[PDB]
Coordinates of C-alpha atoms in Angstrom, one line a residue:
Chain A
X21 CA 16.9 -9.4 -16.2
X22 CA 14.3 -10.3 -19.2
X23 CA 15.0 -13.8 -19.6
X24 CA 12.2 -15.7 -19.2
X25 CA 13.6 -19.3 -19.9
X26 CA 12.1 -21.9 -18.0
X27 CA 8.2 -20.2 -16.9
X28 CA 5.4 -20.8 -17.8
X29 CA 3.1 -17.9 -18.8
X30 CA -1.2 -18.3 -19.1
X31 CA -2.2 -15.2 -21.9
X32 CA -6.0 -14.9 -22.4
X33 CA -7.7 -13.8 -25.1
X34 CA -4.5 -15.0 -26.7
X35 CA -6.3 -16.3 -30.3
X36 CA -5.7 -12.7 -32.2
X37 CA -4.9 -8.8 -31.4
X38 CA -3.0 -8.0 -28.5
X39 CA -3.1 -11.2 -26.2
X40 CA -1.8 -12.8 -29.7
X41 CA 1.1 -10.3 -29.8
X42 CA 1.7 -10.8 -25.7
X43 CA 2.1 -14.3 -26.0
X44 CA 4.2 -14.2 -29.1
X45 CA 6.2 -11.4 -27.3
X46 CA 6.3 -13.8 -23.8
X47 CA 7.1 -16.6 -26.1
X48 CA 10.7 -14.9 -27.6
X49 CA 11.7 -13.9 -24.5
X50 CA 12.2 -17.7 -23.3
X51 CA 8.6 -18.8 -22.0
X52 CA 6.4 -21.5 -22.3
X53 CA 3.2 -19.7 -23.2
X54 CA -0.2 -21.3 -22.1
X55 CA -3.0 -19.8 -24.9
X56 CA -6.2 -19.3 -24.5
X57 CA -9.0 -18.1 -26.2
X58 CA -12.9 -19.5 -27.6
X59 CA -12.3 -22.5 -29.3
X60 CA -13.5 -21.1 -32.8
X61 CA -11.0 -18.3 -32.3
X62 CA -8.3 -20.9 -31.4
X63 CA -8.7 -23.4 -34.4
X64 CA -8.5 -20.2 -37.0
X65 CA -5.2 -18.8 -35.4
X66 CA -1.9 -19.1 -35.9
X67 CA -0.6 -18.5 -32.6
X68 CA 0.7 -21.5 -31.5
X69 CA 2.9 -21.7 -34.4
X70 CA 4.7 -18.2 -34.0
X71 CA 5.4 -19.5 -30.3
X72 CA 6.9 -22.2 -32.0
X73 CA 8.8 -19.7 -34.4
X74 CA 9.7 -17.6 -31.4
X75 CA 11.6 -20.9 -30.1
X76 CA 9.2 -22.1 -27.3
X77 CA 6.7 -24.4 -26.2
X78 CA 2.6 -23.7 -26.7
X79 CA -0.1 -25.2 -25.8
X80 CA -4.2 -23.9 -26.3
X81 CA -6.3 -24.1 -23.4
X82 CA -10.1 -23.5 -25.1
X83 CA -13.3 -22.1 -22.9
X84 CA -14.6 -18.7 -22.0
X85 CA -12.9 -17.0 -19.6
X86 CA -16.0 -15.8 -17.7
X87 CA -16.4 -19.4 -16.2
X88 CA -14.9 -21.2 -13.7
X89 CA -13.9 -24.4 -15.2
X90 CA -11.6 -22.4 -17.7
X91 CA -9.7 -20.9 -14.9
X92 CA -9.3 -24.1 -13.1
X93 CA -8.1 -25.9 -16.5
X94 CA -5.6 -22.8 -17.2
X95 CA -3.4 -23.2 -14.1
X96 CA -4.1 -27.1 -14.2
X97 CA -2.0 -26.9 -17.5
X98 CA 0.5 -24.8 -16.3
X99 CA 1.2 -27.1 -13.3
X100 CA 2.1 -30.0 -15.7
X101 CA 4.4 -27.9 -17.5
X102 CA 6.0 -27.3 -14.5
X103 CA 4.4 -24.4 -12.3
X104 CA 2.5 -21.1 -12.8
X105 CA 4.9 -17.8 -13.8
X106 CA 3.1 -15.2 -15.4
X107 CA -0.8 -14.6 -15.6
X108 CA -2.0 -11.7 -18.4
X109 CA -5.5 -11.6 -18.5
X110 CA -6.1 -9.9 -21.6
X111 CA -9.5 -11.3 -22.6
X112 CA -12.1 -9.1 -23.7
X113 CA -15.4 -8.1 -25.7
X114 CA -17.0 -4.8 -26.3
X115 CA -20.7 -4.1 -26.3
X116 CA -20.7 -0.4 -26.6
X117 CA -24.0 1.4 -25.9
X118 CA -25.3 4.6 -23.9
X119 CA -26.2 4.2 -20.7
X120 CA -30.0 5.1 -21.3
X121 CA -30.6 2.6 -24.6
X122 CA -27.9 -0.5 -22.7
X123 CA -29.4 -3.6 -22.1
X124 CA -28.9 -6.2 -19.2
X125 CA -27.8 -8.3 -21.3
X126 CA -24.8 -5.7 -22.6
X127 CA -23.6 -4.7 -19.3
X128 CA -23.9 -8.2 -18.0
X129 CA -21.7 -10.0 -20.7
X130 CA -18.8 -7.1 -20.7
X131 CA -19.0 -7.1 -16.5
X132 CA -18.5 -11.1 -16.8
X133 CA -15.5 -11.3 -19.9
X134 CA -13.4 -8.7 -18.4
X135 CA -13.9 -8.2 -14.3
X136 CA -15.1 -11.9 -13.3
X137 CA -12.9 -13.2 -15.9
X138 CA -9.9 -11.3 -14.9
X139 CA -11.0 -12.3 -11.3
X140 CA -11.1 -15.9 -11.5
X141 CA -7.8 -16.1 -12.8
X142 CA -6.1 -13.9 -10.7
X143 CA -7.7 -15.8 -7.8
X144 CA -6.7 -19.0 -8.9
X145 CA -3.3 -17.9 -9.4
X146 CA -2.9 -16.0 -6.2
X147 CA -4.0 -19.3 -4.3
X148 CA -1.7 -21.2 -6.3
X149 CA 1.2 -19.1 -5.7
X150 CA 0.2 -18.9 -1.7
X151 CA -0.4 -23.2 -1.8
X152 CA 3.9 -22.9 -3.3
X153 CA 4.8 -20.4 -1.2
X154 CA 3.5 -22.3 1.8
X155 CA 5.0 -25.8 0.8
X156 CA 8.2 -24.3 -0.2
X157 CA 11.0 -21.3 1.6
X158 CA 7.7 -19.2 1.7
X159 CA 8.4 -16.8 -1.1
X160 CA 7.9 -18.3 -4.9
X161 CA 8.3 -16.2 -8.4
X162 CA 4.9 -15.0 -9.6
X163 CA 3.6 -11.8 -12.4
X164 CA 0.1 -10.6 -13.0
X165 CA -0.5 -8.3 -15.9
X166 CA -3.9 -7.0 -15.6
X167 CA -5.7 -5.1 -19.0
X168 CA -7.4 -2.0 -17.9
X169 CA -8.2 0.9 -20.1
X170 CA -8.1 4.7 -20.0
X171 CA -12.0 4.2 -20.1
X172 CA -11.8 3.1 -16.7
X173 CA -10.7 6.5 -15.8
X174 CA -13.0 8.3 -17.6
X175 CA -16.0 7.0 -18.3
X176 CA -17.0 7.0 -21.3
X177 CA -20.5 7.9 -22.8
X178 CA -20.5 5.1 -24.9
X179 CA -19.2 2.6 -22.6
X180 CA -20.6 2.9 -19.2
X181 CA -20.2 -1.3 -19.1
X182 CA -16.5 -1.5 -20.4
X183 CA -15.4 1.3 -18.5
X184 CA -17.2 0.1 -14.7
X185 CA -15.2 -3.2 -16.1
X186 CA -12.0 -2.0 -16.4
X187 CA -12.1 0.5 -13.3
X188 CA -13.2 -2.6 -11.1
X189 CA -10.0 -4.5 -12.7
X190 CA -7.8 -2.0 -11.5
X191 CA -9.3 -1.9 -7.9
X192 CA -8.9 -5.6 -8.0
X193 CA -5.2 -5.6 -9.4
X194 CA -4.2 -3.3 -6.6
X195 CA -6.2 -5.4 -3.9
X196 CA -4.1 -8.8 -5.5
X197 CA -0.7 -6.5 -5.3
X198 CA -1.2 -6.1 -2.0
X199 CA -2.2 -9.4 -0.7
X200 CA 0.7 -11.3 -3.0
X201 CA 3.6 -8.8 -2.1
X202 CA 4.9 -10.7 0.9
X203 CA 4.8 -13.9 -1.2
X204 CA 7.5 -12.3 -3.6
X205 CA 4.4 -11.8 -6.8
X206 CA 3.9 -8.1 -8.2
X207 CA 1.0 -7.3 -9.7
X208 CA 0.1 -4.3 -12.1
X209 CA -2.0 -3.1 -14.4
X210 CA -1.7 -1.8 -18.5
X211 CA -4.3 0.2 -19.9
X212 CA -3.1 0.1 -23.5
X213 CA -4.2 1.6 -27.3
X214 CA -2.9 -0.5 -29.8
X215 CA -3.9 -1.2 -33.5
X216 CA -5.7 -4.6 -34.2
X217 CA -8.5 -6.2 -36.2
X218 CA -10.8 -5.2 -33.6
X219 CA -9.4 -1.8 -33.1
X220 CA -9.5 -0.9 -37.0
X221 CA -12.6 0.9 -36.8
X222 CA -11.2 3.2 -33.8
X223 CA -8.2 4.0 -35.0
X224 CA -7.8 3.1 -39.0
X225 CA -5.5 1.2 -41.0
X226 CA -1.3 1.1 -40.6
X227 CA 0.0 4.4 -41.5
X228 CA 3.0 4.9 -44.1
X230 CA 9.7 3.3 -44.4
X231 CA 12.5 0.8 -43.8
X232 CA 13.4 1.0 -40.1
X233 CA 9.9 2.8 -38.7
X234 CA 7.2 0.9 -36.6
X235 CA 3.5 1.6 -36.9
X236 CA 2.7 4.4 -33.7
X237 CA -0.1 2.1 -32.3
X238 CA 2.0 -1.0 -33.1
X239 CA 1.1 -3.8 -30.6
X240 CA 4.8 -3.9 -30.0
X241 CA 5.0 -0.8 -27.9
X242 CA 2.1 -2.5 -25.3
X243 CA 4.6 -6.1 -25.7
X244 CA 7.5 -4.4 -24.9
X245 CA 6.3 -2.9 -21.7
X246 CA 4.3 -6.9 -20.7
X247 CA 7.5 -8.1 -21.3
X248 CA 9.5 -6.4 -18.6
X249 CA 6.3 -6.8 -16.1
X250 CA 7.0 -10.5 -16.4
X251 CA 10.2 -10.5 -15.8
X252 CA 12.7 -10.4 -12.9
X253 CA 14.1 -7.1 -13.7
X254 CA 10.7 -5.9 -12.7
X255 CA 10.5 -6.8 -8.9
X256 CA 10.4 -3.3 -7.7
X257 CA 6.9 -2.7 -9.6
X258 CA 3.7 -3.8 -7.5
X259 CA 0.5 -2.5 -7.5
X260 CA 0.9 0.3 -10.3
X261 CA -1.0 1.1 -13.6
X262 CA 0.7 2.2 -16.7
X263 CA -1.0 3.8 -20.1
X264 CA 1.3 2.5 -22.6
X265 CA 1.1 3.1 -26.4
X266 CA 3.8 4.0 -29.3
X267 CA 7.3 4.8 -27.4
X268 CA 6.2 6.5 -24.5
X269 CA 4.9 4.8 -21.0
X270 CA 3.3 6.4 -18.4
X271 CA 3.1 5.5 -14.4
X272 CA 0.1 7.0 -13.8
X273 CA -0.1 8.8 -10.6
X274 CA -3.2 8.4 -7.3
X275 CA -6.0 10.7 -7.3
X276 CA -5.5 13.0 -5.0
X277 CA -7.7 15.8 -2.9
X278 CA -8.9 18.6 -4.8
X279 CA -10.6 20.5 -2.4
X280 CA -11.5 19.5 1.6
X281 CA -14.7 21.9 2.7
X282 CA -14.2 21.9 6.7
X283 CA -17.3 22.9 8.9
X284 CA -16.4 26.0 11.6
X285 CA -18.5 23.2 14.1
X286 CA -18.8 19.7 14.7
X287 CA -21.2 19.4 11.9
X288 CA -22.2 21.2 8.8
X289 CA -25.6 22.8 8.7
X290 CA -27.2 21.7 5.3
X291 CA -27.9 24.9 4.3
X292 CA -23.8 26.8 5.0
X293 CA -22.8 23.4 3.2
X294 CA -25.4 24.2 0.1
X295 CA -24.1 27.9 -0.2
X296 CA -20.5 26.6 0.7
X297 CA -20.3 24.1 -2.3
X298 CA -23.1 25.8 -5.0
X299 CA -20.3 28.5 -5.0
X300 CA -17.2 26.9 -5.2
X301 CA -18.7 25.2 -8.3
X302 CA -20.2 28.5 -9.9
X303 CA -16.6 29.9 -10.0
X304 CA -15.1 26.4 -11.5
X305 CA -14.1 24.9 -14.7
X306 CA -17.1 23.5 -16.1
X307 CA -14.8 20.0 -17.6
X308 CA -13.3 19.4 -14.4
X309 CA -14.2 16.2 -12.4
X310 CA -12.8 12.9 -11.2
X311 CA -12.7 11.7 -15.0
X312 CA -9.1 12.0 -15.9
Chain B
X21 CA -33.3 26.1 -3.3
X22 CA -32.7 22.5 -0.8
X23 CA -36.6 22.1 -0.6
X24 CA -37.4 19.0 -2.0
X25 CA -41.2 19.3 -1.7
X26 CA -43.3 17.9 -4.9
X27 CA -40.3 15.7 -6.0
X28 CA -40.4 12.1 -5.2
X29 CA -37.2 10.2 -4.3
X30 CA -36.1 6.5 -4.5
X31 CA -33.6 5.1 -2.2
X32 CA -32.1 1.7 -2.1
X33 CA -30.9 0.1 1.1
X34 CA -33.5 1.5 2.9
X35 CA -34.6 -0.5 6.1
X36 CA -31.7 0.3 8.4
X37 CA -28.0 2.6 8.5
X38 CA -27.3 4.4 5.8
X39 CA -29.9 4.3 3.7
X40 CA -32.6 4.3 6.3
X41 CA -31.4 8.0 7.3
X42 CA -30.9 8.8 3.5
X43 CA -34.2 8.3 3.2
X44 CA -35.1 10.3 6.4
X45 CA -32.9 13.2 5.3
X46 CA -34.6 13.3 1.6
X47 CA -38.3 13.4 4.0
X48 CA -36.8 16.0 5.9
X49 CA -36.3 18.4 3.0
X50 CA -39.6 17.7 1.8
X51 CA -39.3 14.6 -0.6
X52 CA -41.6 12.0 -1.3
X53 CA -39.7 8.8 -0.7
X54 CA -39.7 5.3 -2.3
X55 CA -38.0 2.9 -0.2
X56 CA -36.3 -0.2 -1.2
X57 CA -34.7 -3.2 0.6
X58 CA -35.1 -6.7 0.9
X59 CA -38.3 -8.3 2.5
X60 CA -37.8 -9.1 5.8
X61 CA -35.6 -5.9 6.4
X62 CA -38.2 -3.7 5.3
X63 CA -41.2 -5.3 7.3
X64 CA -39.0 -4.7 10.5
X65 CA -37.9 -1.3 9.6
X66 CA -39.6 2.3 11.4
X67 CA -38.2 3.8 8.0
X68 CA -41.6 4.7 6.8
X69 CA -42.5 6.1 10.5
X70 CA -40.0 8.1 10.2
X71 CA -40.7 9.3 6.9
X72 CA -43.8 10.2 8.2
X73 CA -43.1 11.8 11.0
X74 CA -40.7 14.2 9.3
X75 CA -43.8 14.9 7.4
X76 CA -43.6 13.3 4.2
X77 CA -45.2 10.4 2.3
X78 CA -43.3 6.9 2.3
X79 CA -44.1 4.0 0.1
X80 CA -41.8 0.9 0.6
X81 CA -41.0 -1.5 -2.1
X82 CA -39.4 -4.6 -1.1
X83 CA -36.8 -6.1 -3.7
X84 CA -33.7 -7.6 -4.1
X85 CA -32.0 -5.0 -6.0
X86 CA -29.4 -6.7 -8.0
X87 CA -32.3 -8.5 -9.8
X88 CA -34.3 -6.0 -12.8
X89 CA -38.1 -6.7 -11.6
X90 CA -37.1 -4.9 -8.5
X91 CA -35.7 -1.7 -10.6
X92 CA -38.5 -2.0 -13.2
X93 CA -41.6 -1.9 -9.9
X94 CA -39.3 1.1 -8.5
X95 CA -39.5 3.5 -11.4
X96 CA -42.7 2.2 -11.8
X97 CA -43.9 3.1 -8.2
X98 CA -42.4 6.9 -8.9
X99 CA -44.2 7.3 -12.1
X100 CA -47.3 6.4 -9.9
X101 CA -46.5 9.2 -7.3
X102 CA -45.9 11.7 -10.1
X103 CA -42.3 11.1 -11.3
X104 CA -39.1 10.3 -10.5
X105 CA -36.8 13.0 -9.9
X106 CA -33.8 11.7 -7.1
X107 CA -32.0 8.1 -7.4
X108 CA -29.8 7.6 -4.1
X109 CA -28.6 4.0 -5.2
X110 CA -27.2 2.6 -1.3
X111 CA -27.8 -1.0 -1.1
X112 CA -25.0 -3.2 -0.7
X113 CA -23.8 -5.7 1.6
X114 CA -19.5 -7.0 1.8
X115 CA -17.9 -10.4 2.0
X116 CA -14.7 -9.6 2.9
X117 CA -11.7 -12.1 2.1
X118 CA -8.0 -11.7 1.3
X119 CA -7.8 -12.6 -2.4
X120 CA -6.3 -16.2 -2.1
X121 CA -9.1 -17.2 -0.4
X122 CA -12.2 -15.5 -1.9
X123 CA -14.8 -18.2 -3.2
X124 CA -17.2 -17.3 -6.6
X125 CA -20.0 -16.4 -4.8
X126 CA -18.2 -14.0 -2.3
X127 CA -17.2 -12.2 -5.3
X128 CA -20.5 -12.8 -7.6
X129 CA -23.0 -11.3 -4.7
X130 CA -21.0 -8.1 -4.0
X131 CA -20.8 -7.3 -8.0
X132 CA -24.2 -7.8 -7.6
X133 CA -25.6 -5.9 -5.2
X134 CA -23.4 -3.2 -5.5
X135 CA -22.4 -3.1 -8.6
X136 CA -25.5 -4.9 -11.0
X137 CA -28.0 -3.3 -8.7
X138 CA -26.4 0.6 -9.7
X139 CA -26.4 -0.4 -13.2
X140 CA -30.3 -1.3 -13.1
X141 CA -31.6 1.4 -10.9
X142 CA -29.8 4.1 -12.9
X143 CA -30.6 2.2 -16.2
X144 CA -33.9 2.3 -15.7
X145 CA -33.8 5.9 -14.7
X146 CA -31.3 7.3 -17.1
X147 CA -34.2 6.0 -19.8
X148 CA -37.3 7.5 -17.5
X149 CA -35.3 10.5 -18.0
X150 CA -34.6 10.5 -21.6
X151 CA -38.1 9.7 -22.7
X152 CA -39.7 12.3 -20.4
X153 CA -37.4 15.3 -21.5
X154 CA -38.2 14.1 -25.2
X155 CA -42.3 14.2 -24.4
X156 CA -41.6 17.7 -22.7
X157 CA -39.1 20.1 -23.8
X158 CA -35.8 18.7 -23.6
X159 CA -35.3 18.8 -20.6
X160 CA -36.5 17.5 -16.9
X161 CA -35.2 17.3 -13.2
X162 CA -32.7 14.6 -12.5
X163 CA -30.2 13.4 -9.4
X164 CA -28.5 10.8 -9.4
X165 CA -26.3 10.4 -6.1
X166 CA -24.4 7.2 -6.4
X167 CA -22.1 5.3 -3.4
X168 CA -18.7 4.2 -3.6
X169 CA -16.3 4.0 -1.6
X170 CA -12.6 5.0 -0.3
X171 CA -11.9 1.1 -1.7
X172 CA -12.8 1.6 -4.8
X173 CA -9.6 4.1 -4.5
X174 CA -7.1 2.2 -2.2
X175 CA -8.0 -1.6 -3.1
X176 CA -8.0 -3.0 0.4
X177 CA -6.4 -6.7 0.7
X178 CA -9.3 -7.7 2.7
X179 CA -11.9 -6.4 0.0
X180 CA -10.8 -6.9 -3.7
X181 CA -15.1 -7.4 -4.8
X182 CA -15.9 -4.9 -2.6
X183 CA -13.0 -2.1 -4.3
X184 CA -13.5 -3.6 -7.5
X185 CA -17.2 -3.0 -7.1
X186 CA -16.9 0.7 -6.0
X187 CA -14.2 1.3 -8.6
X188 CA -16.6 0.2 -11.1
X189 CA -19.4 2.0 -10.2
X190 CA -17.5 5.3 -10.2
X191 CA -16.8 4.9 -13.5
X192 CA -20.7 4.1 -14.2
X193 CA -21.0 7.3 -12.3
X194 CA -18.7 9.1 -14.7
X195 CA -20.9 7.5 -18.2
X196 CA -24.3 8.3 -16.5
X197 CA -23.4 12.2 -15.9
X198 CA -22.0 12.3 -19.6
X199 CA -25.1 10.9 -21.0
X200 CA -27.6 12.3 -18.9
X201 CA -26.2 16.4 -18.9
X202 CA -27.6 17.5 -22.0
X203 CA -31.3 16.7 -19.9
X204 CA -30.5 18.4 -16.9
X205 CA -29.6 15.9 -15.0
X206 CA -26.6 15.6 -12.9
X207 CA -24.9 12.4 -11.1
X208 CA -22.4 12.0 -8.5
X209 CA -21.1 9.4 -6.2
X210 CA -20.1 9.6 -2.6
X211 CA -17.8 7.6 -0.7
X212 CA -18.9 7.9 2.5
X213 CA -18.0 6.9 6.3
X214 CA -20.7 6.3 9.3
X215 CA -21.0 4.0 12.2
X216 CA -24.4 1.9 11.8
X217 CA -25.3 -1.9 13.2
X218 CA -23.4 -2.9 9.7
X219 CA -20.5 -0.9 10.9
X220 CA -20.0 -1.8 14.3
X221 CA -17.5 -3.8 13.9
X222 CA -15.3 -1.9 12.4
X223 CA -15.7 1.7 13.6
X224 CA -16.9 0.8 16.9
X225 CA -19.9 1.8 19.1
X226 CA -20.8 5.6 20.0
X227 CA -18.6 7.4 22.5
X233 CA -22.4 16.9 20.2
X234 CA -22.6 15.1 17.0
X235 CA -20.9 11.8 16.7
X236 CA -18.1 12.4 14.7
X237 CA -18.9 9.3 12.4
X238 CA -22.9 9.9 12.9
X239 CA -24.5 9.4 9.3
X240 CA -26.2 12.8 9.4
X241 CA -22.6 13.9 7.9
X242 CA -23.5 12.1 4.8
X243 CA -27.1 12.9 4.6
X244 CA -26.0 16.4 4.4
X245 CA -23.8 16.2 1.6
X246 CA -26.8 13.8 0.0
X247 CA -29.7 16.5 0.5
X248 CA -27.5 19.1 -1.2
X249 CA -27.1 16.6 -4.3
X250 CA -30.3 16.1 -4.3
X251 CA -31.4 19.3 -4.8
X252 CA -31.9 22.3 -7.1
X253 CA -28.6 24.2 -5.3
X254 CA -26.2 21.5 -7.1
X255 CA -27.1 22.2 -10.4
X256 CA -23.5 23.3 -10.9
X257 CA -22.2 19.3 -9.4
X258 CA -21.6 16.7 -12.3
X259 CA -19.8 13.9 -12.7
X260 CA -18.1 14.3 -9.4
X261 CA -16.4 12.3 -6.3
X262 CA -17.2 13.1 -2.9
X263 CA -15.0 11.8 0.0
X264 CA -17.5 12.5 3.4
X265 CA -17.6 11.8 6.7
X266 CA -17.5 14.3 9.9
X267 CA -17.9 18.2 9.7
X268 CA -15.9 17.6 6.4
X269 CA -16.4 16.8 2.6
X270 CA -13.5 16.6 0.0
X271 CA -13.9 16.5 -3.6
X272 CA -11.1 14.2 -5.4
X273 CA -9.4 15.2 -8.2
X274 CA -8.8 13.2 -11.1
X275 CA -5.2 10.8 -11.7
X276 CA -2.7 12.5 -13.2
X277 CA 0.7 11.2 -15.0
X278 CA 3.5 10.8 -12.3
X279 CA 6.2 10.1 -15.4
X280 CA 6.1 9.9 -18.6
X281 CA 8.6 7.3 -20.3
X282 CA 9.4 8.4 -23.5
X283 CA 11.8 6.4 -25.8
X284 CA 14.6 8.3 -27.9
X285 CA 13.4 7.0 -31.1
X286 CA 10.1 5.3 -32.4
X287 CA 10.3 2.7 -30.2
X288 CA 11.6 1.5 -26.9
X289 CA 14.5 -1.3 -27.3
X290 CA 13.3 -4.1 -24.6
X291 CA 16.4 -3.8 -22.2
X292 CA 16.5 -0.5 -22.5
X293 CA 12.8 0.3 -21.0
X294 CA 13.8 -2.2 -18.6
X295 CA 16.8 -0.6 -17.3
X296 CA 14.5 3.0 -17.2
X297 CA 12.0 1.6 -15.1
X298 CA 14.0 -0.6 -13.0
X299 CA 16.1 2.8 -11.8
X300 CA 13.0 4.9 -11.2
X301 CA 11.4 2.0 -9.1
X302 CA 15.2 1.3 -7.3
X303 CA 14.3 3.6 -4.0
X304 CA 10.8 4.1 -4.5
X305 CA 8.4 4.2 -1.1
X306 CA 6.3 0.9 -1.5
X307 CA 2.9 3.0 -0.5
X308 CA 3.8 5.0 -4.2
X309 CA 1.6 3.6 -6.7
X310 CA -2.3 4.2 -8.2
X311 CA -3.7 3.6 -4.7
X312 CA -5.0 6.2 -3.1
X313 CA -5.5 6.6 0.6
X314 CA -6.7 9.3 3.3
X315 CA -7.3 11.7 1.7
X316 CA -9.5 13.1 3.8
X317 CA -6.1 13.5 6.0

């Protein structure tokens, strides 16, 4: 079911935070865990010794994410441990700002850590996993866990690059879900909220008892990557859960709201103009495609 | 009320298909209209013919739009013609390949154009905006009509940079109208159909208004480009044919709630192993057809 013993898994972002906790969390359930992360963030962290406390193998991988070579050298490691198993691309960066006062520079650098990062390791994997498929019975054991975020649903003011990021991820995950299925690999996508050095100005510090976990534990988010790496999880393929404290949710396709049919072949501009300026008078003013 | 006359309007994509009768509709209702493509498109265009000939005034600016001079000379060129009031950001071109085998710079040249050259344009014009409602009175006339597409809902297996790029600038979409509101301004993307040279291959040629004919879509884009959607922000617009629909937001399917302050491992697994046990394959986040 959850036994992992014997894959490999490649975590990114994997130095501190949640990628820290993922591989830590992959690590206990049996894998050998692939970290990686800036070299700086790797030579401070303690990672690779709570994989070795979990009971597994580690091994650090440094580079940025955002270029090629570090994808390339990712599955190149896993190989010589024995094949590829598990991808989490996790890596990230924030550079929050308006969309009137952002610089190129802002959107560019969040667009290349999170969707070309996330897409050069999903590619490489997914051609990986075709190349085994191919030389072996056609079928071969493969999990992506993809990071998006509930700002790729919504928008946010303050995060026009981060959320374009994370929406693109998703579009992506589902795009690798389908063309992987056949092959045997599932692919899905988290969009977690858990508490972190990096998260401590959103959310604060731990709360409160002998027994209780912290409600934005990084647990809750591990529990849930755990299972989407496993066996027990080949029904699940191309779906996005929220997940934070005890409660998961399978988020559901957007769906049709309103379809405005023309009496002819075409709508005049002007019956289309009355048509929707008067739907919308008479509508909630909140209500949009932002979930 | 739809007229457009006195307001000047840039559109991107210009020279030919979707954008070249963009920037014909825009004429016809009485907009000034700055067209963008690149180079050699543009100098073999009749765009700015027919610009004219609807009875407007066309000024073409040639640019790749993915790189910022190209933003920065068409806000300029507005300001020049009196302002900037409409953004129809169109241009875009696909490199379609299943996942596996997708190079870099199929990937890197769709985020681009698509997805870099949205970010610039309405950069730029989300900060024209700001600054002229702060030198006014707080407020001044803004459209933004953006384009994504039905992949940026469904993630084809032949498109992930393509999706991923309409995905993402949906949610730039989203930011821009929550930013730019409180001006006036209102921005909305489109996900539209039509059968142009581009789309030949896939629609097919022309068998009465074509049923795929891109006046459907220039209908939809004079309306959000005008006074009478005042009321439209932050929106999705599925349209192609006689027939627009408006999407609706995700909502939760199931919510997976553990009996105490955690979920015990096996026991989430068990959960959602059940609830996925005779689940329909085509049940997930994509979305498809929904014009259907």
């Amino acid at each position: 079911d959850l036994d992992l013993s014997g894959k490999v898994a490649v975590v990114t972002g994997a130095a501190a935070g949640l990628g820290r906790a993922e591989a830590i969390g992959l690590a206990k359930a049996g894998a050998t865990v692939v970290v990686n992360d800036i070299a700086g963030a790797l030579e401070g962290s303690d990672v690779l010794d709570e994989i070795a406390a979990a009971g597994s193998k580690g091994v650090a991988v440094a580079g940025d994410i955002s270029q090629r070579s570090t994808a390339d050298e990712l599955v190149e490691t896993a190989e010589g441990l024995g094949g590829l198993d598990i991808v989490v691309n996790n890596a990230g960066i924030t550079r929050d700002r308006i969309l009137f006062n952002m610089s190129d520079e802002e959107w560019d650098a969040v667009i290349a850590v999170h969707l070309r990062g996330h897409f050069l390791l999903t590619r490489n994997a997914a051609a990986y996993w075709r190349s085994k498929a191919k030389a072996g019975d056609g079928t071969v054991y493969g999990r992506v866990i993809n990071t998006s975020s509930e700002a790729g649903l919504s928008g946010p003011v303050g995060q026009p690059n981060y959320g374009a990021a994370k929406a693109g991820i998703t579009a992506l995950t589902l795009s690798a879900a389908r063309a992987l299925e056949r092959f045997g690999v599932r692919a899905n996508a988290i969009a977690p909220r858990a508490r972190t050095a990096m998260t401590a100005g959103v959310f604060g510090d731990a709360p409160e008892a002998e027994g209780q976990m912290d409600p934005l534990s990084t647990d809750h988010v591990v529990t849930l990557v755990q299972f989407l790496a496993a066996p027990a999880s080949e029904g699940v393929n191309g779906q996005l859960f929220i997940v934070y404290g005890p409660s998961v949710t399978l988020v559901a396709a957007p769906t049709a709201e309103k379809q405005f049919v023309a009496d002819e072949d075409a709508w005049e501009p002007a019956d289309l103009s009355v048509t929707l300026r008067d739907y919308f008078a008479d509508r909630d003013p909140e209500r949009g495609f932002s979930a």
